């Protein structure tokens, strides 16, 4: 199944059809279809005309990760709606601000209702890994599922580089700061009690769990 459907082979036609359906006939190809690319370049104000081909041929998580902070062209039809201007005007705003305090109610509800000291109430009963797939007699399957379970860009994006390591590449190895593999994109849990499902046995629960 694997060696005749998924991997390329001399008698298989996977790679040929893949290129023929993803490159030769992609409608965002500037080599064949220029005017459509120039059309969207006028619309979205994109600086590079290959960006539509890049977006059309990138997985969603990977395209989410390499998010670009570059501003667009200023002659575009991308007209920033008043909600985006409201969100960007309060991106780093102090307290005692009229537009500042209107646009954060979740932090007010957090601080008012004391959500920083609440306790975990639910833990799941069974936790499992993804179901393992076991193909006998090939190392390509082992490499493929080990790469897919532990993709270093996705794993490193849900990660953090240690501080002395960031010292080591930034000063000792001289790596520029913007060329670091990006980290810290894992969502913050609500509390320290919500971080992990394991609950320690509490001394106070021993004190309070008895009638006598």
């Amino acid at each position: 199944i694997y060696e005749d459907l998924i991997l390329p082979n001399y008698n298989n036609d996977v790679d040929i059809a893949n290129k023929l359906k993803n490159v030769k006939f992609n409608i965002f190809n500037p080599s064949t279809n220029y005017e459509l690319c120039l059309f969207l370049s006028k619309l979205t104000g994109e600086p590079s005309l290959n960006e539509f081909f890049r977006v059309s041929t990138t997985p969603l998580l990977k395209r989410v990760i390499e998010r670009t902070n570059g501003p667009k062209n200023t002659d575009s039809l991308s007209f920033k709606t008043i909600t985006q201007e409201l969100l960007e005007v309060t991106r780093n705003a102090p307290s005692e601000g009229v537009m500042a305090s209107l646009l954060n109610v979740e932090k007010h509800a957090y601080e008012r209702e004391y959500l920083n000291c609440i306790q975990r109430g639910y833990h799941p009963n069974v936790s499992a890994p993804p179901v393992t797939i076991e193909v006998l007699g090939s190392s390509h399957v082992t490499n493929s599922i080990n790469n897919e379970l532990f993709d270093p860009l996705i794993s490193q994006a849900l990660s953090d580089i240690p501080a002395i390591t960031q010292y080591n590449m930034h000063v000792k190895k001289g790596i520029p700061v913007e060329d670091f593999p990006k980290t810290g994109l894992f969502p913050e849990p609500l509390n320290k009690n919500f971080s992990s499902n394991i609950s320690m046995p509490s001394m106070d629960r021993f004190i309070t769990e008895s009638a006598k």
């Binding site: 290129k19 490159v23 409608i27 190809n29 500037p30 080599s31 220029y34 005017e35 690319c37 120039l38 059309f39 969207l40 370049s41 006028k42 619309l43 979205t44 994109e46 600086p47 590079s48 005309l49 290959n50 539509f52 977006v55 059309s56 395209r63 062209n73 002659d75 039809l77 991308s78 007209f79 709606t81 008043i82």
Partner: protein
């Protein structure tokens, strides 16, 4: 030029004079003099473009030419004006509401025209040099872009440099830059350097080397419909929804702000609006909610001229339970001016069959044309239109290039029509499954 010979491929346009009067036969359309004059009035009203929200209706018997007139006004309107031809059933969608689908079809039919001046610098690159002093001068470089004929040397900037090195650029890539905006187009590897590597990358493409002047300057015009601005403004990477259909009920404030921006953009003269025609074929299959939204969707200045077709007489309006003229409620028929088509005589039928025969490249004898005229008068126009091609197939199976009366006789024998099928069903009702589901499958009893 991917098309084949369809039903409406002979209709090149509304065959009118300079004072809006139809010819007896010109530019495809035969007869229908009053309706064609009315459609020409409609076309001139579209081309003036100073009137918004008119609703017009084409009513007639089946196979009389309402969609023929619609394709005529579409072809006479020409390009760079947005024309949208939807059906009644395309409104009903599971994850996109019907009223908002009407809003999508309304905003897809009015365009705004923007002119742009381009200064194209396209040619094969040779060398990118390093003039920076530990990135001093903001990573300055020198470019060696060449066409076939002339070669020149430029100096680039920091944004230009990390734009290129963000791309996969090296010597041999056919690259393109705007002089003004600096937009980067990496077309691919030049075809002259074809045998540099025996194996090539997946994204690598082979482009011919550009020939002539480097700094060509061209002005392009852009005609964008008003729905596309909402598409690209609703999301972040919104251009995908222009092609994948997952717009998903764009909110009303986005449309409001875009209308305000279009009014500002036209007030300063940098853009102008181009109104079009929203053609709704088979409008009788809209329920009362679609009609109630259509009645108030034609009172805005950003509303195209809606043209509808209906072959139903006094019929039941869907979504309700009362009879009504045209299959439409009376409040909609109050707002609409109705263009009426009429049936044809034998002469109009034989000229239409002659045009459709020349369109499908079938040469006809006179007797076959008269027999097809009689069959078109008796049964229907479209059956005699359909008989021509199968008669041609019978002719080449007989090793004759032209069709005689014998081929039309054989095609009439082999392929039936509506009335003969009705008679041959009512003759032998027992062999057919019916409304009560009872049938005698056995042959002998």
């Amino acid at each position: 030029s991917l098309s084949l010979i369809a039903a409406h491929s002979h209709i090149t346009g509304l065959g009118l004079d300079e004072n809006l009067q139809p010819r007896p036969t010109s530019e495809g359309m035969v007869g229908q003099l009053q309706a064609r004059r009315a459609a020409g009035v409609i076309l001139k009203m579209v081309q003036n473009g100073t009137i918004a929200g008119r609703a017009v209706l084409v009513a007639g018997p089946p196979s009389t030419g309402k969609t023929a007139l619609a394709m005529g006004v579409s072809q006479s309107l020409g390009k760079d004006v947005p024309f949208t031809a939807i059906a009644g059933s395309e409104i009903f969608s599971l994850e996109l509401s019907k009223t908002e689908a009407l809003t999508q079809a309304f905003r897809k039919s009015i365009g705004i025209k923007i002119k742009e001046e381009t200064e194209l610098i396209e040619g094969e690159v040779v060398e990118i040099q390093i003039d920076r002093s530990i990135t001093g001068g903001h990573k300055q470089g020198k470019l060696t872009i060449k066409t076939t004929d002339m070669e020149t040397i430029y100096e680039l900037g920091n944004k230009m440099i990390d734009g290129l090195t963000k791309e996969k650029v090296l010597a041999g890539d056919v690259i393109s830059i705007d002089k003004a905006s600096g937009k980067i187009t990496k077309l691919g590897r030049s075809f002259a350097r074809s045998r540099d590597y025996d194996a090539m990358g997946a994204d690598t493409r082979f482009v011919q080397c550009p020939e002539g002047e480097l700094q060509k300057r061209k002005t392009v015009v852009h005609t964008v419909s008003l729905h596309e601005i909402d598409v690209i403004n609703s999301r972040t990477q919104g251009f995908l929804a222009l092609f994948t259909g997952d717009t998903g009920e764009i909110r009303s404030e986005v449309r409001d702000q875009i209308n305000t921006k279009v009014a500002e953009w036209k007030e300063e003269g940098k853009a102008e609006i181009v109104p079009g025609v929203l053609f709704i074929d088979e409008v009788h299959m809209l329920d009362i909610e679609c009609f109630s939204f259509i009645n108030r969707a034609l009172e805005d200045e950003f509303a195209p001229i809606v043209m509808m077709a209906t072959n139903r007489g006094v019929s039941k309006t869907r979504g309700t339970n009362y009879k009504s003229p045209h299959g439409l409620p009376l409040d909609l028929l109050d707002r609409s001016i109705i263009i009426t088509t009429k049936s044809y005589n034998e002469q109009e039928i034989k000229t239409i069959l002659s045009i459709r025969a020349q369109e499908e490249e079938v040469e006809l004898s006179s007797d076959a044309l008269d027999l097809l005229t009689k069959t078109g008068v008796e049964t229907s126009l479209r059956y005699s239109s359909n008989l021509i091609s199968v008669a041609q197939q019978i002719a080449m199976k007989r090793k004759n290039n032209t069709v005689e009366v014998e081929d039309v006789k054989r095609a009439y024998l082999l392929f039936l029509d509506s009335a003969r099928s009705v008679k041959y069903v009512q003759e032998n009702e027992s062999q057919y499954i019916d409304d009560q589901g009872n049938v005698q499958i056995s042959i002998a009893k």
